[PDB]
C-alpha cells in the first residue's frame, strides 16, 4: 500500500545539478489546468535526482526545484511538464 486514491500514478525522475550542501531540495509540482494542489517533494539535500511518484497523468505540472539552504529556498530548477504522452 502507498496508493490511497491515486492509482494513475506516473513517475517523473527529475534530475538537477548539484547546488551544494543543500539542507533540503523541495520540489514543487504545480498542477496546471486542475485544482490540484502543488505536490511538494522533499528530497535529501545532497541528492541531485528524484523519482517523483504520484503525478497524475494527463495533468500539467510546473515542476520547480528550490534548495533549502540557510533557511531559504533558492531556484535550482524549473520546468513545465505535462504527464502521460503529450
Curated annotation (Swiss-Prot):
UniProt-annotated glycosylation sites, renumbered to this chain? 1
Tissue-level expression:
Expressed in the inner limiting membrane and around blood vessels in the retina (at protein level). Plasma FN (soluble dimeric form) is secreted by hepatocytes. Cellular FN (dimeric or cross-linked multimeric forms), made by fibroblasts, epithelial and other cell types, is deposited as fibrils in the extracellular matrix. Ugl-Y1, Ugl-Y2 and Ugl-Y3 are found in urine.
Domain Fibronectin type-III intervals = 1-86
Q: Where in the cell is it found?
A: Secreted, Extracellular space, Extracellular matrix; Secreted
Post-translational modification note: Sulfated.
Q: How does it assemble?
A: Mostly heterodimers or multimers of alternatively spliced variants, connected by 2 disulfide bonds near the carboxyl ends; to a lesser extent homodimers. Interacts with FBLN1, AMBP, TNR, LGALS3BP and COL13A1. Interacts with FBLN7. Interacts with COMP. Interacts (via type III repeats 9-14) with TNFAIP6 (via CUB domain); this interaction enhances fibronectin fibril assembly. TNFAIP6 may act as a bridging molecule between FN1 and THBS1. Interacts with TNR; the interaction inhibits cell adhesion and neurite outgrowth. Interacts with FST3 and MYOC. Interacts with SVEP1. (Microbial infection) Interacts with S.aureus FnbA.
Give the disease association: Glomerulopathy with fibronectin deposits 2: Genetically heterogeneous autosomal dominant disorder characterized clinically by proteinuria, microscopic hematuria, and hypertension that leads to end-stage renal failure in the second to fifth decade of life. Spondylometaphyseal dysplasia, corner fracture type: An autosomal dominant form of spondylometaphyseal dysplasia, a group of short stature disorders distinguished by abnormalities in the vertebrae and the metaphyses of the tubular bones. SMDCF is characterized by flake-like, triangular, or curvilinear ossification centers at the edges of irregular metaphyses that simulate fractures. These corner fractures involve the distal tibia, the ulnar aspect of the distal radius, the proximal humerus, and the proximal femur.
**What's the stated role of this polypeptide?**
Fibronectins bind cell surfaces and various compounds including collagen, fibrin, heparin, DNA, and actin. Fibronectins are involved in cell adhesion, cell motility, opsonization, wound healing, and maintenance of cell shape. Involved in osteoblast compaction through the fibronectin fibrillogenesis cell-mediated matrix assembly process, essential for osteoblast mineralization. Participates in the regulation of type I collagen deposition by osteoblasts. Acts as a ligand for the LILRB4 receptor, inhibiting FCGR1A/CD64-mediated monocyte activation.
The name on file for this protein is: Fibronectin
User: Which organism encodes this protein?
Assistant: Homo sapiens (Human)
Fragment boundaries within the full protein?
A: 2199 to 2284 of 2477
Amino acid at each position: 500500500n502507498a496508493s490511497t486514491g491515486q492509482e494513475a500514478l506516473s513517475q517523473t525522475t527529475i534530475s538537477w545539478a548539484p547546488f551544494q550542501d543543500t539542507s533540503e531540495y523541495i520540489i514543487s509540482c504545480h498542477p496546471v489546468g486542475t485544482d490540484e494542489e502543488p505536490l511538494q517533494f522533499r528530497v535529501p539535500g545532497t541528492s541531485t535526482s528524484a523519482t517523483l511518484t504520484g503525478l497524475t497523468r494527463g495533468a500539467t505540472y510546473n515542476i520547480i526545484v528550490e534548495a533549502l539552504k540557510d533557511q531559504q529556498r533558492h531556484k535550482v530548477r524549473e520546468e513545465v511538464v505535462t504527464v502521460g504522452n503529450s
